[PDB]
Design an enzyme around this catalytic site. Structure first.
Site, short mmCIF file in Angstrom:
data_model
loop_
_atom_site.label_atom_id
_atom_site.label_comp_id
_atom_site.label_asym_id
_atom_site.label_seq_id
_atom_site.Cartn_x
_atom_site.Cartn_y
_atom_site.Cartn_z
N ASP A 25 77.33 3.90 23.01
CA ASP A 25 76.69 2.70 22.73
C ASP A 25 75.10 2.94 22.60
OD1 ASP A 25 76.94 -0.91 23.81
OD2 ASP A 25 75.55 0.28 22.13
N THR A 26 74.63 3.26 21.18
CA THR A 26 73.09 3.30 21.00
C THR A 26 72.12 2.31 21.35
OG1 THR A 26 73.26 3.12 18.79
CG2 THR A 26 73.66 5.29 19.39
N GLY A 27 72.96 1.16 21.37
CA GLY A 27 72.06 -0.29 21.86
C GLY A 27 71.76 -0.40 23.25
#
Ligand SMILES: O=C(N[C@@H](Cc1ccccc1)[C@H](O)CN(CCCc1ccccc1)S(=O)(=O)c1ccc2ncsc2c1)c1cccc(O)c1
EC number: 3.4.23.16
Lengths: 99, 99
Positions: A25-27
């Site tokens: 999850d890059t967010g």
């Protein structure tokens, strides 16, 4: 590996003696794992997402293996519906976005 | 480009003719923008994240230019804490995770 985004980028992680599925999850600034009774000291924290905040327990210097790659760092434990691998560990396994 | 993850993967987008900053978010199924006006019909929808559910406005088939790459797809508008580019549009611009 390369992971396309047609489906949720779920991978197998290993933490505190358990194998789990977790979202790359890059967010996510931080790593947030579903409730698990980890040993050791922790600090309370609140983290905010879509919908509001949840209360989590912050455990530090926890070894965690992600899709075969070793990492170690802070993991937040609380009532998330999905295990989330955030940037704090994604950087450790050399993960980039590419287009 | 290749984007590393020691900082939030924020990029400039262009939508309805306006420039905005948005987060490339592999943990997000859908694209969710902060409250704004967009042209055309929309329908009410609800989506859920770490802290619960929110009400959004679903706009279909909306053109967005993301870091110089063209996409046209569904954009949700509502009280997301940050502008989020989700997998529905990350796939359109050829974005993959790599490690
Ligand atoms: O929130 C979604 N997805 C989230 C992950 C997810 C997936 C499934 C179920 C629950 C959660 C995000 O990927 C991570 N979060 C921060 C990112 C956005 C964002 C960014 C900043 C503020 C608010 C939203 S997040 O899960 O809320 C998150 C993760 C780590 C972390 N560390 C410190 S704060 C923090 C927040 C999401 C997006 C679109 C549609 C949808 O139905 C769900």
């Amino acid at each position: 590996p390369q992971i396309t985004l047609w489906k949720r980028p779920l991978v197998t992680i290993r933490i505190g003696g358990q194998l789990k599925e977790a979202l790359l999850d890059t967010g996510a600034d931080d790593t947030v794992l579903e409730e698990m009774n980890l040993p050791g000291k922790w600090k309370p924290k609140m983290i905010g997402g879509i919908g509001g905040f949840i209360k989590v327990r912050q455990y530090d210097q926890i070894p965690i293996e992600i899709c075969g790659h070793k990492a170690i760092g802070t993991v937040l434990v609380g009532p998330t519906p999905v295990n989330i691998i955030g940037r704090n560990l994604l950087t450790q396994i050399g993960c980039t976005l590419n287009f």
